Amino acid sequence: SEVAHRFKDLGEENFKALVLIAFAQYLQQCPFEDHVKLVNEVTEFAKTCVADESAENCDKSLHTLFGDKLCTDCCAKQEPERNECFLQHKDDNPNLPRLVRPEVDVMCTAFHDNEETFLKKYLYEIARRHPYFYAPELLFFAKRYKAAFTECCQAADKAACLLPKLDELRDEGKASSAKQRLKCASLQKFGERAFKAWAVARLSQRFPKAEFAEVSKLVTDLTKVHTECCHGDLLECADDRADLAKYICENQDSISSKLKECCEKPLLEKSHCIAEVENDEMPADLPSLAADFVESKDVCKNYAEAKDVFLGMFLYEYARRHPDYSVVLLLRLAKTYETTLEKCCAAADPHECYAKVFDEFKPLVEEPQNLIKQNCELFEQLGEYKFQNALLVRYTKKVPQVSTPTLVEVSRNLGKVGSKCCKHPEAKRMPCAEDYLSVVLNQLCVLHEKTPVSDRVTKCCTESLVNRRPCFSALEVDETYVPKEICTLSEKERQIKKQTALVELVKHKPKATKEQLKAVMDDFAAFVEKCCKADDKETCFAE
């Protein structure tokens, strides 16, 4: 039996949570209570199978069990089709009510009143809104969400304790979710071969000192971990993640110097810690690449006898000595390299043909560096909010077909690059920026996927995972496009209206000039400013 094997390894507490998540991600509209029942059933039944591993129905696969309970058009179907069904019925942007925290004391009453139902409430509300959220991590998040109610519902000021943490958690959760969503899209839309390269790139960067053989292993295990979490095999996802976190720490010496602090802590903390570690220090004298990937006489041989292992050995070797490069760059270079080997090893003298393959890299490397230098100059020259509007406008013109809420949402997130990254030294900027942008652009891509309107966005999104940022950056304003025919708000609120309006304002006269925008923008901000001052306001807003 399988249920048992998990219940045991994960413990009831976590089992129960995961199983909840699994469900609330699968059916996002279904009410809270409605799930908890199904959870508790499943949980009781598991226990039975813990007692009698050869009890009735314990012979079944989790999917079947879960799908079944859930089913109490997808449900007219059977495994595996059925599961794939639910997996493809996941909504990235539900028409679910905005989330809003009732007054502090109100929560602090409910938290002591019913502590369990309260956390389950949290997991439930997040999970249905982030159907691709990294389940294990969501537990970390939940414990840290408990830890704040424990303390702050027990101090002089609750509001100036609790809320400030919850603003941090919402922020952090939004990032994690978005980052994970990239992982899941990479896998599902580009297949594992592709994720593997990504991992190989990133981990070679976290763990320079590690021999390829180790990194390959890690990549395997990690890929297995994510594959599962994205195919909705959360229980196994978490276990396997644990087992991985346990593995890494035993073999620490052969992986990174940095892990010690992380490895010392509890199951949940350390898996996150590790995920988040700093890059290990760059080993000393590492033979220049060129020897084995350009000057060698056996390039064209090894690419024949083991293209994967060879190109991997390459990605590894280049990645480990470039923590300054984005992953997506490194992948591109890897692709260029593969490509060129392909053409060259079909020539008269291949040594000659491929000999200059590094010259090809200068462009691919520079294209990003410039772009970042420039919009970091820009960022510091404008500040984040204003900075967001320039991206807003830039992009809105590029894809005036995309829905306003999405445009705003994405633009704003593009905006944070500046503040996130521009404070770093050049050395650490590009992997910060570009790889963040790769996440945000993926939000676009998926939100767009749902309800497609712009063949250009689609092209960029589907054509290649790695070249998306250049593909988007490339885009000139869309000429085909046919022009489109409250006072008691927080700053962040006011911003999102103003911006929302800005998009409509661009969609109206795309061939606008920054000046004749300044002019219309200002006009309207004045309008709202005056119509805030009062009288019978609505009578004022008459226009």
Swiss-Prot record:
Phenotypic consequence of residue 161 to F: In Hawkes bay
Disulfide bond annotation, renumbered to this chain: 49-58, 71-75, 74-85, 108-153, 152-161, 184-230, 229-237, 249-263, 262-273, 300-345, 344-353, 376-422, 421-432, 445-461, 460-471, 487-532, 531-540
Tissue: Plasma.
GO biological process, one term: cellular response to calcium ion starvation
Residues annotated as glycosylated: 8, 47, 121, 146, 183, 209, 217, 260, 265, 297, 301-302, 307, 335, 362, 397, 423, 428, 478, 498, 507, 509, 518
UniProt site positions, description: Aspirin-acetylated lysine: 183
GO molecular function: antioxidant activity; copper ion binding; DNA binding; enterobactin binding; exogenous protein binding; fatty acid binding; identical protein binding; protein-folding chaperone binding
Annotated site residues (Not glycated) in this chain: 16, 37, 60, 69, 77, 90, 120, 143, 158, 165, 174, 179, 189, 196, 224, 246, 258, 270, 343, 356, 373, 386, 398, 416, 420, 450, 459, 484, 492, 497, 511, 514, 530, 533, 537
Matches recorded under CDD domains: ALBUMIN (cd00015)
Residues reported to bind Ca(2+) 2: 9, 239, 243
InterPro entries referenced in this protein's UniProt entry, alphabetically: ALB/AFP/VDB (IPR000264), Serum_albumin-like (IPR020858), Serum_albumin/AFP/Afamin (IPR021177), Serum_albumin_CS (IPR020857), Serum_albumin_N (IPR014760)
Recorded superkingdom: Eukaryota
Effect of residue 59 to N: In Malmo-95/Dalakarlia
Keywords: Calcium, Cleavage on pair of basic residues, Copper, Disease variant, Disulfide bond, Glycation, Glycoprotein, Lipid-binding, Metal-binding, Methylation, Phosphoprotein, Repeat, Secreted, Signal, Zinc
Modified residues (N6-methyllysine): 507
Sequence positions bearing Phosphoserine: 1, 54, 61, 257, 403, 473
Albumin domain: residues covered: 1-170, 171-363, 364-543
Positions bound to Zn(2+): 63, 231, 233
Function in brief: Binds water, Ca(2+), Na(+), K(+), fatty acids, hormones, bilirubin and drugs. Its main function is the regulation of the colloidal osmotic pressure of blood. Major zinc transporter in plasma, typically binds about 80% of all plasma zinc. Major calcium and magnesium transporter in plasma, binds approximately 45% of circulating calcium and magnesium in plasma. Potentially has more than two calcium-binding sites and might additionally bind calcium in a non-specific manner.
Subunit structure: Interacts with FCGRT; this interaction regulates ALB homeostasis. Interacts with TASOR. In plasma, occurs in a covalently-linked complex with chromophore-bound alpha-1-microglobulin with molar ratio 1:2 and 1:1; this interaction does not prevent fatty acid binding to ALB.
Name this protein carries in UniProt: Albumin
Organism of derivation: Homo sapiens
